[PDB]
Design a protein around this ligand. Structure first.
Ligand SMILES: [Zn+2]
Lengths: 76, 315
């Protein structure tokens, strides 16, 4: 199925995935497309940050859903 | 009074900044102070909502220049998000996302026209995720994907608890960038389910349901061959009357917000400091919270290029 990612500049990119694909696998695809290292990506959907080790279906991500890609401004 | 500062436990200003923003989120604060939470989960755990609420109750029964320790609280958010176990510098929006997800889970009560599809998707979402926390933050995006070959418009509806906005500068500019017709072509060509082949498509967001509290997260980041850096662009956001009607899926649906809190970051993507500016629910007056230090400020000092998360309440 296809899903989208809204990237840092607001560009949207398109991924082909399966519900059973792991979030890490998704970040790997984003990296193929955008060259951001997976450890730097955070993906947000329905208010949850997607975690490595889960799959898309654990987050109920449907065909043509959009994941929102952000990085980090570390501070403390 | 609500002007207690929070103790920095070691690079925890990202955490303190968000907690003050939530402390001054009126309906969320009240929920804790009336302990409606005890009345109200996805598992057996309640200690995160308990310590969060006791922290808010302590801030709001405190005297100015009291400093409150969020130590007990931190111990509990760590169990949801082990990322926060240490005392490293961290991202406030990541923190906000895990914190609200944790609170939410602990008090969780659980072919058509597009309009109707949206309303049914929404019900499906609330059948799974329904809490007082969600009540406050949750909204619904509509995404329309139109094939430029056959003209089919495929619509889907995704819940959101905040919006992460590209930086175009005015806040409205950033919202227009978020909601613009995105042309999906070349390597991004989607498969049209009617054409059943890859076609140039146009994808566009609009807001189908507006939340009571709208958190906007500015994507202050730029990826380059040369370097990943923070964008320090000044994004001019209004204090009052942020009117989002032009972004609504339905023509009339009125959606006007006033600011009440801002989480500020200063630095790079790799390190820096956070503070908060927050308007007191009771008095309407703004204060700067920089950990243990709380000082009055004027609303004319609230817009700065350090703003990273904006907390708006629906008027
Ligand atoms: Zn088509």
């Amino acid at each position: 199925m296809q899903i989208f990612v809204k990237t840092l500049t607001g560009k949207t990119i398109t991924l082909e995935v399966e519900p059973s694909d792991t979030i890490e696998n998704v970040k790997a695809k984003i990296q193929d497309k955008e060259g951001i290292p997976p450890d730097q990506q955070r993906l947000i959907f329905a208010g949850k940050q997607l975690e490595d080790g889960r799959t898309l279906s654990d987050y109920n991500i449907q065909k043509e859903s959009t994941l929102h890609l952000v990085l980090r401004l570390r501070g403390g | 009074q609500g002007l207690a500062g929070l103790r920095n436990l070691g690079n925890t200003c990202f955490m303190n900044s968000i907690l003050q923003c939530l402390s001054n989120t009126r309906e969320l604060r009240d929920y804790c102070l009336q302990r409606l939470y005890m009345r109200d989960g996805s598992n057996a755990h309640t200690a995160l909502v308990e310590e969060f609420a006791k922290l808010i109750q302590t801030i709001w029964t405190s005297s100015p220049n009291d400093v409150v320790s969020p130590s007990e609280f931190k111990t509990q958010i760590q169990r949801y998000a082990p990322r926060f176990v240490g005392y490293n510098q961290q991202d406030a929006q990541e923190f906000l996302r895990f914190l609200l997800d944790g609170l939410h889970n602990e008090v969780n009560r659980v072919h058509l026209p597009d309009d109707e599809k949206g309303r049914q998707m929404w019900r499906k979402y609330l059948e799974r995720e329904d809490s007082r926390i969600g009540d406050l933050f949750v909204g619904q995006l509509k995404s329309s994907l139109t094939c430029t070959d056959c003209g089919y418009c495929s619509t889907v509806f995704d819940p959101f608890w905040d919006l992460s906005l590209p930086i175009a500068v005015t806040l409205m500019d950033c919202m227009r960038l978020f909601t613009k017709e995105d042309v999906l072509d070349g390597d991004e060509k989607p498969t049209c389910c009617r054409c059943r082949g890859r076609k140039r498509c146009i994808k566009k967001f609009s807001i189908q349901r507006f939340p009571k509290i709208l958190v906007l997260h500015l994507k202050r980041f730029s990826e380059s061959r040369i370097r990943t850096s923070k964008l320090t662009t000044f994004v001019n956001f209004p204090l009052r009357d942020l009117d989002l009607r032009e972004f609504a899926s339905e023509n009339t649906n009125h959606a006007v917000y006033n600011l009440y809190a801002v989480s500020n970051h200063s630095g790079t993507t790799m390190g820096g400091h956070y503070t908060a500016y927050c308007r007191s629910p009771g008095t309407g007056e703004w204060h700067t919270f920089n950990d243990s230090s709380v000082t009055p400020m004027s609303s004319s000092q609230v817009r700065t290029s350090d703003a990273y998360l904006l907390f708006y309440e629906l008027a």
